[PDB]
Amino acid sequence: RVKIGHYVLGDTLGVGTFGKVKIGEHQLTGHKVAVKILNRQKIRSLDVVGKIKREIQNLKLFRHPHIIKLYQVISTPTDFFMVMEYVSGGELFDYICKHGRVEEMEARRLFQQILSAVDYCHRHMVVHRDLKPENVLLDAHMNAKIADFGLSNMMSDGEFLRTSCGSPNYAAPEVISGRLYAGPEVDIWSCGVILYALLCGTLPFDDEHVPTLFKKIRGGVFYIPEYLNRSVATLLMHMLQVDPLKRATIKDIREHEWFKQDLPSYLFPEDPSYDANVIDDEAVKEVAYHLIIDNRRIMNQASEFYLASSPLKPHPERMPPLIADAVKKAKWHLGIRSQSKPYDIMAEVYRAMKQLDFEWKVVNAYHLRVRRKNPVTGNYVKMSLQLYLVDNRSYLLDFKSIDLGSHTMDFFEMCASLITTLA
Amino acid sequence: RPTVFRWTGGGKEVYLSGSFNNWSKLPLTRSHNNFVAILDLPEGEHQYKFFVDGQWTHDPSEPIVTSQLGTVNNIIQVKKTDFEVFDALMVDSQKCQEPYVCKPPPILPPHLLQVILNKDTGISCDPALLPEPNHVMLNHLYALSIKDGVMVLSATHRYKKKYVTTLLYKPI
Amino acid sequence: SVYTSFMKSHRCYDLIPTSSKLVVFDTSLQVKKAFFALVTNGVRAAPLWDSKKQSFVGMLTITDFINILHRYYKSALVQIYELEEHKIETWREVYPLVCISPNASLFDAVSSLIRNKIHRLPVIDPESGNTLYILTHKRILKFLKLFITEFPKPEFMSKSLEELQIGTYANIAMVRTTTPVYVALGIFVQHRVSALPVVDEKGRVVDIYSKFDVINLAAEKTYNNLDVSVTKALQHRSHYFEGVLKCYLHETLETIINRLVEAEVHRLVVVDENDVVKGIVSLSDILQALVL
Ligand SMILES: N#Cc1c(O)c2c(-c3ccc(-c4ccccc4O)cc3)csc2[nH]c1=O
Ligand SMILES: Nc1ncnc2c1ncn2[C@@H]1O[C@H](COP(=O)(O)O)[C@@H](O)[C@H]1O
Ligand SMILES: Nc1ncnc2c1ncn2[C@@H]1O[C@H](COP(=O)(O)O)[C@@H](O)[C@H]1O
């Protein structure tokens, strides 16, 4: 008879992307919990030992009404027990199957809660890359419950993601192509199809042949039924845009007319009922609570004092255009370019570091982590080099900074010395 | 201080005997293919062994020991650092420079092409103001075409919860 | 009263905009290029970085551009060799860094602005050594404006300007409508004032010539002919945006502060019953009165 900390284990609810989740009932009371079980032997061979640590440190700090809460994590000499919140409504995928489609009155509500949960994750630099109606759980009151992170990852400043994970469907065009992506724009794409599957009942990109399926996704062409109104139609085409730069963001969706209707004001950070119903980020820093919170809302609602606008009265300090020798404004470009062989470029930057005395380690055939010691301050100035591919017969060398004088200036002076001594 | 004894082999019924049971046989509960039993064991080394369908058998993967008489049983070492999550991950991460090179390509991500210094801000706000930069364009160097011997560099860094795009006019 | 205890609470960090642009010059940069760079980047002033000693040494502002012009200007027939040849490092020889931590109070900011008689203060993070933002008077007063309805209103805000005696009302530096720019630039150097109200023969203010209107000589590259009148230099904006701006001695302080933050200018011209001058209430005058 299996007991793990007052909880008795029962039937398996299912096996996730990592680990087996099974229901647990309190021995004395009957309180139901879901216990995800992680084998310690699986973890070391996958080298995900550091990735489980990250997911645990983040899931225990999460607190959203539409995300499965983690109550505690029990450690055993052979396995880890992640006891968490239990819901009885089952998968959303099974709810879309029970009914034909979902009424837009209810489909809107479920979509809002889900995107709320997504937003919360992106604000904590966590991107859940396995968003699907199989991972959206339901409770007794038909509320959304995002779960099964596993394929989730953190977002660092100036760092892209590489891993092509998720279902064949629901996956962004740049994921199935194995390209580099930012993070958030992928979760919006999986939410687009989730919105489609919620309303239509079927999938926008579906084919028995997997190569032909990827062809449809990259093509980004899907059938829009006529029982979908003009309003919600525009939103879907915006969320499922192929080019990630044209694709909608969470702020874009939140301003959409179909989304703003019947929207509860407790779901989003700058909504009227948020500053009084949700404990924010001033909890860790601290009449004192209300005073600090009030200070932020004043600074927040002054969007023209902290953030620039986009194309009234001209600002007094606005500069006139510099006259001829008006001149055409110069354009800024990324790093430096070349059209020679990739091997020639790396062979050229290698001899370039000899003349400047750079110490460096090789992480990849196109990723160098260089380092120079500042002769004046004594500090070490290091940066990141990465050769990319542009168009067809074009290349680009990228420069990235790594954390008595000034670090920003040190990064600039080190780049300039390398750029000058490089053809 | 729990401890998980799982039997992965086949069988209609599996027992567990060890020093804890005084080598008596403890009935294991069955799932689909797993025979498991969680006990409360102190810190140290404990000798255990399974009994499946009639024959004394041990788990091949688990470390063994010989009691100077041919008897071979499994050995589990219940450490004190097995009951703390991070202290167990530390022992699982600890158990898991300046080169000259040697040299024995990814497509450019379209996000780094959104130059922040090339977009207008509308003649309504302070000239020093800029739009909020993407988190992935941070720390990346942007430059201009050199004109009359002066090189101009720029990058967007982050301090606390703010963003400063610094430009450096530097003659060469 | 409660205004002083306010600025002792808020750090300088609360003034820094979420995203901003910070031009920086190397000391070895040719000074002429540095002045053009200020025009192209839309920035009013830039921190100076001495590459040799690896530390910020000061600021380059439009005042420096006025100093260079006034010091070396023979005529419109001969070019200004030094302005074309000098470097930032070399000019600083012919003519200490004042900064502040972002974690320092907003009260220390206003204090450091007055004690050092400067208009722009470089906010430098002591942790990373990097420069973050350039603090000004317009930035500070506009910040307090966001909280004049949060922090209770003291008694003096309802008082007239004549009662509070705020600003300068003696020996007001002015220029004529036909006053050459060089002569105007000389007034900027001698009396060290931010702006010079322009007056006609009748004695009324027709226009105002600030220090900001001088870089327009570097923008249009008309800096080699300083013999032209001050009106000719204000012709580029004479057709649009104006303007004028002024106040009275009977107007309340609150009405005046509201007038400054709205027009986003540094000063008002205190006129009489007509358009003739009577005094100048500056932003440095108001901030000084809400600290002492
Ligand atoms: N997949 C998987 C998996 C487990 O089931 C367990 C188990 C386990 C085995 C069986 C049971 C069980 C036993 C009787 C009835 C129901 C059960 O879920 C509970 C937990 C303990 S550690 C572990 N590690 C795993 O990777
Ligand atoms: N045109 C002017 N003539 C005389 N004094 C002035 C003038 N403009 C400003 N002031 C005074 O100079 C001091 C600093 O002002 P500002 O240079 O505008 O910060 C204050 O005492 C002002 O009242
Ligand atoms: N009282 C005023 N009336 C009209 N224009 C002004 C006034 N004060 C400043 N300006 C203008 O505001 C711009 C910035 O000057 P400053 O306020 O000195 O930074 C310049 O174009 C000035 O001519």
Author numbering:
A (entry chain C): 10 to 295, 322 to 346, 363 to 376, 396 to 473, 532 to 551
B (entry chain D): 78 to 173, 189D, 190D, 191D, 192D, 193D, 194D, 195D, ...
C (entry chain F): 27 to 121, 128 to 324
Quote the authors verbatim.
AMP-activated protein kinase (AMPK) plays an important role in regulating energy homeostasis in eukaryotic cells. The α-subunit contains an N-terminal protein kinase domain and a C-terminal regulatory domain. The γ-subunit contains four copies of a cystathionine-β-synthase domain27, and we previously showed that the γ-subunit binds three molecules of adenine nucleotide.
The first of these to be reported was A-769662. Initial attempts at co-crystallisation with A-769662 were unsuccessful likely because of the relatively weak binding, poor solubility and the presence of additional, non-specific, binding sites that promote protein aggregation. Utilizing the crystallization conditions for 991, we were able to refine conditions that gave crystals of AMPK in complex with A-769662. Although the diffraction data were limited to 3.9 Å, unbiased electron density maps clearly show that A-769662 is located in the same binding site as 991 and how it overlaps with ring-1 and ring-2 of 991. The two activator complex structures therefore confirm the interpretation of our functional and binding data that A-769662 and 991 activate AMPK through binding to the same site at the interface of the kinase domain and CBM. While there was no CD change upon binding of A-769662, this compound competed for the binding of 991 to AMPK. Together, these data establish that there is a single-binding site common to A-769662 and 991, and likely related compounds. Compound 991 binds about 10-fold tighter than A-769662. Thus, by promoting this CBM/Kinase/regulatory–fragment interaction, 991 and A-769662 enhance protection of the activation loop against dephosphorylation.
